[PDB]
Amino acid sequence: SFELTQPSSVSVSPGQTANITCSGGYLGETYRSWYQQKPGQSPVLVIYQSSKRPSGIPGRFSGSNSGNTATLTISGTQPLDEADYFCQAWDFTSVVFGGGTKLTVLGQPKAAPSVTLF
Amino acid sequence: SFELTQPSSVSVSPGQTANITCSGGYLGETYRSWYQQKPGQSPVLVIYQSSKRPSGIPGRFSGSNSGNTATLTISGTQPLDEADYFCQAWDFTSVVFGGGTKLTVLGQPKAAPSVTLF
Amino acid sequence: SFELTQPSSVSVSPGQTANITCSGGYLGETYRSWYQQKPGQSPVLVIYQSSKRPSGIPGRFSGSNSGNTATLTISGTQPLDEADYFCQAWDFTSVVFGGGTKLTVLGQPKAAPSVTLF
Amino acid sequence: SFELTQPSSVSVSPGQTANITCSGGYLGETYRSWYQQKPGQSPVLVIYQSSKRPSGIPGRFSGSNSGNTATLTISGTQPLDEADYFCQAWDFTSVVFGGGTKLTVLGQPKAAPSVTLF
Amino acid sequence: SFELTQPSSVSVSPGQTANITCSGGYLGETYRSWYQQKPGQSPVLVIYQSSKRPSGIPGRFSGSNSGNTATLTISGTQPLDEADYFCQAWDFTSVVFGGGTKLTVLGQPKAAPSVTLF
Ligand SMILES: *[C@@H]1O[C@H](CO)[C@@H](O)[C@H](O)[C@H]1NC(C)=O
Ligand SMILES: *[C@@H]1O[C@H](CO)[C@@H](O)[C@H](O)[C@H]1NC(C)=O
Ligand SMILES: *[C@@H]1O[C@H](CO)[C@@H](O)[C@H](O)[C@H]1NC(C)=O
Ligand SMILES: *[C@@H]1O[C@H](CO)[C@@H](O)[C@H](O)[C@H]1NC(C)=O
Ligand SMILES: *[C@@H]1O[C@H](CO)[C@@H](O)[C@H](O)[C@H]1NC(C)=O
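A: This is the predicted complex of the input protein with 2-acetamido-2-deoxy-beta-D-glucopyranose.
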């Protein structure tokens, strides 16, 4: 009596586990006395954009492209007064497998005993 | 008596587990006395955009393209007074498999014992 | 007596599990005394957009394209007074399999014992 | 006596499980005394848009295209007073399989024992 | 009697585990007396952008490209007064497998004992 056992286990299980927490804290203000005099608050902001014949990736493929061509990003630039930003901008990008990928998983266990018993 | 067992297990199970939390905290204000005098609050903001013949990816494929061509993003730029932003902008992008991917999973276990017993 | 068992299990089960929570907190204000005098609040905002012959992806395919051509996004830019934004903008994009993907899963277990017993 | 068992299980079951919660909190205001004088509140906002021969994807296919051509988005830009935004804008996009996908699942287990017993 | 056992285990399970925490602390202010006089607050900010024939990756593929072509990023630049930024900008990018990758996992254990016993 013979036993042939081949518990082949081809396992692909990538995974990210995250405990993510933001706490704004405790902000206490007691017996605050104030006298604020701000006449003539006249901020000026001028943004000008001109473009001619812009291009990006004018060639062969780019697998993953998060970069840009000539662009403009403006965030939180000119806060004048009592501006509170708590956990304001959280950008989380979790990628297990990127772009332009070829996955060829071949799990084909072979067991063909050529047994002759006489 | 013989036993042939091949519990082939081809398992692809990627997964992300996340505990995500935002707490704005405790904001206490007791006996706040205030005198605010702000005549003539005249902010000015001018945004101008001109484009001519813009292009992006004028070539072969891009697998994943989150980047842009000449664009403009404006967020939270000019808050004047008592502006509170708590967990304001949360951008979460979780991708298991990206774009432009070819997955060929071949689980074809083979067991053909050529047994002769006489 | 012989037993042939091949419990082939071809399993593709990717999945993301998320506990997501926003709590605006506790905002307490007791015995607040105020005197606010703001004559002549005259904000000015001018947005101008002109485009000529814009284009995007004038070529071969793009698998996934979340990026843009020349565009303009304006969010929360000029809040004047007592403006509260709690968990205001949450953008969640969870993709298991992206665009432009070819999945060929072939689970064809084979068991043909050529048994001769005499 | 022999037993041939092939419990082939070809299972494709991707799935996302989410506990999603927003709580605006507790906002308490006791004994608030106020004197607000705001004559002549005259905000001005001018938005101009002109386009000529715009185009997008004037080529081969795009699998999934969430990006735009020259567009304009305006959200929450100019809130003047006592403006509260709680869990205001939630954009959730959960995609299991994207666009432009070809799925060929072939589960065809084969068991043809060529048994000769004499 | 003989036993042949080959518990082949081909396991690919990369994963990142993270405990992430932000606490804004405790901010206490008691018996604050203030006299603020700021007439004529007139900040000026001028941003000009001009581009002609920009290009990026006008050649063969780039596997992963997070870098940009001539762009402009403006963040938190000119905060005038009482501007608090707590855990303001958190950019987390966790990638298990990058772009432009070819994964060929071949788990095909072989066990064919040529046994002759007579
Ligand atoms: C952290 O995550 C683990 C499991 O990954 C869990 O046991 C624990 O409760 C989590 N703690 C926090 C504070 O999120
Ligand atoms: C964290 O998630 C784990 C399971 O992943 C769960 O046991 C626990 O209760 C969660 N805790 C929080 C604070 O979300
Ligand atoms: C977290 O999710 C787990 C299961 O994933 C569940 O046991 C637990 O109650 C959840 N907790 C919260 C706070 O959402
Ligand atoms: C979280 O979801 C789990 C199952 O996924 C459930 O047991 C639990 O009650 C949920 N909790 C909340 C707070 O949504
Ligand atoms: C840290 O994570 C571990 C598991 O990775 C968990 O036991 C523990 O509770 C976490 N602690 C904190 C403070 O997040």
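Chain C touches chain D through 118 residues (CB under 8 Å). Residues 76 and 88 of chain C are 10 Å apart (CA to CA).
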